[PDB]
Enzyme design. Structure first.
Site, PDB file in Angstrom:
ATOM      1  N   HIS A   1       0.466  -0.989  -0.015  1.00  0.00           N
ATOM      2  CA  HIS A   1       0.401   0.059   0.435  1.00  0.00           C
ATOM      3  C   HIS A   1       0.277   1.337  -0.213  1.00  0.00           C
ATOM      4  CE1 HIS A   1      -3.235   3.172   0.593  1.00  0.00           C
ATOM      5  NE2 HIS A   1      -2.244   3.617   1.793  1.00  0.00           N
TER       6      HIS A   1
ATOM      7  N   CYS B   1      -0.721   0.486   9.338  1.00  0.00           N
ATOM      8  CA  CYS B   1      -0.434  -0.233   7.864  1.00  0.00           C
ATOM      9  C   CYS B   1       0.837  -0.467   8.807  1.00  0.00           C
ATOM     10  CB  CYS B   1      -0.549   0.184   6.659  1.00  0.00           C
ATOM     11  SG  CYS B   1      -0.437  -0.650   5.545  1.00  0.00           S
TER      12      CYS B   1
ATOM     13  N   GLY C   1      -2.775   4.818   9.744  1.00  0.00           N
ATOM     14  CA  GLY C   1      -1.139   4.852   9.905  1.00  0.00           C
ATOM     15  C   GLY C   1      -0.455   3.842  10.396  1.00  0.00           C
TER      16      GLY C   1
END
Lengths: 299, 299
Positions: free
Chosen positions: A40, A143, A141
């Site tokens: 991502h 991730c 955030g």
């Protein structure tokens, strides 16, 4: 007494780094000279579906920023594996713990180190559910937050990298090979996870824990066999039970057979009405057999 | 999404030591050139009441053994302060974090690093209850396990040293000055803690969390002011509510005043019959305002 707890996080905290690509910031895990992070991080800003193959083909190494506690690592190369990137860096992590990679299966417990901008903020224990999601706590955030277990020899098992939050609030991650648990899409979508089953192995572990705290009002006198229970489980939202021979420890300490607890699961499948078991008003599949044994006996 | 979490433990792991005196082993915390540990480590083996003043007067430094990760430290001197010893060792902990010592008050959340033989095994968040006990998970050898908080500037507040489990299973600790929370005796006894009160500040935070997740079937349009609620709380097993304006960020985002949530607590005090709020079937006081805001907004 049963409390969900996490294993200490110090050795994993020393592996978390901040990975930035363009304006996009998330977390990576630095082991040896490789930082693994969710792909991502290279997604374009858009509302359309993300083509990660195209993003990868157009990726520029200089747009990466990888840093550990404010000091930047030089990126040497990046490859894509499923839903993760392996970022080669010019510096090996001297704090890399003895580790392996391990893919979780439903019912496995593990620890999440929730991280933001490369800095851990919280640690908690979770169970991988039958729909391959976890019930964590993450905001934007998080991730790339790692999930881990620590074996008895001290080997760290790296087993999870946080990927996405579903519309239901359930959380989805990948393993370190890039496979998304449950094969969810690692990008915004309307995907809906299938319904969870009760993890029978864990219910059994929880009832054994109540037996050791003198809580047995619910103890059924009858027994049901595994085949009988498993047929009942399919029809009532429970997983099959794995095996009898695991619980001898608690069978030999209660001394209640698992078939007695399976019968008790059937009787307690509706509400307790209105009693409780270890403070719970319904059956709890939060704790594994290993957790219960470690918490009562340290073994 | 609400998950009870611990703050990362790594900086505290590097301060935990194994403290042995004779055959008795427990945990200590090594800061600078000082190890703090429960004084139980010098208790004679006996069934009758322990005279710690006598044990301290007969103490010999050479009976001590202090180690960090199996590396032994030399004991230079020992002083007793309430229920803890301050053991001076012949070298300073190079990994001593910036820290202070803080005494907890009922309602404070903090983190426990559960340790055995000087080695951390688990980490979890807890609340100091109104009866000055905590609901931890400890087995034999956890004495001296530290409790801590990490402030925003990164200063570690050392606030708890595990001391004893009461007959009820409730857990009792001291602060780092040796004062036992709740004035419990730091040796086996028949002592019993007072009744636990529902922490009303946490219940209000919980209901706000429910509203922010779209769970509002329970919301009362009645209002009860702080003074009236505190009277009601005296009569119903709840603490007073400390203030209203602390919740304004949540009051603005939900449009729901604290006084509405106070009335809602009075409505939900008996039970939900048989609905649930965020999966809970009775009011939850596990989460503080600070926890709710941090986990939902990062603040």
């Amino acid at each position: 007494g049963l409390k969900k707890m996490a294993q200490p996080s110090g050795c994993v905290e020393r592996c978390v780094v901040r990975v930035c690509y363009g304006s996009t910031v998330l977390n990576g895990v630095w082991l040896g000279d490789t930082v693994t992070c969710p792909r991502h991080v290279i997604a374009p800003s858009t509302t359309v579906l993300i083509d990660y193959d195209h993003a990868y083909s157009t990726m520029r190494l200089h747009n990466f920023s990888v840093s550990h506690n404010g000091v930047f690592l030089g990126v040497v190369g990046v490859t894509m594996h499923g839903s993760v990137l392996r970022i080669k860096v010019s510096q090996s992590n001297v704090h890399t713990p003895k580790h392996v990679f391990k893919t979780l299966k439903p019912g496995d417990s593990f620890n999440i180190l929730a991280c933001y901008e490369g800095i851990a903020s919280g640690v908690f224990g979770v169970n991988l559910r039958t729909n391959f999601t976890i019930k964590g706590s993450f905001i934007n955030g998080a991730c790339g937050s790692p999930g881990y277990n620590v074996r008895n020899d001290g080997t760290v098992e790296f087993c999870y990298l946080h990927q996405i939050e579903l519309g239901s609030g359930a959380h989805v991650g990948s393993d370190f090979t890039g496979s998304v648990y449950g094969n969810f899409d690692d990008q915004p979508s309307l995907q809906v996870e299938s319904a969870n089953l009760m993890l029978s192995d864990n219910v059994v572990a929880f009832l054994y824990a109540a037996l050791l705290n003198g809580c047995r009002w619910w103890l059924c006198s009858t027994r049901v066999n595994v085949d009988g229970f498993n047929e009942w489980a399919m029809a009532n939202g429970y997983t099959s039970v794995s095996s009898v021979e695991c619980y001898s420890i608690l069978a030999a300490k209660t001394g209640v057979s698992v078939e007695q607890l399976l019968a008790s699961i059937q009787h307690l499948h509706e509400g307790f009405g209105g009693k409780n078991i270890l403070g719970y008003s319904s059956l709890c599949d939060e704790f594994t057999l290993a957790e219960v044994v470690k918490q009562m006996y340290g073994v």
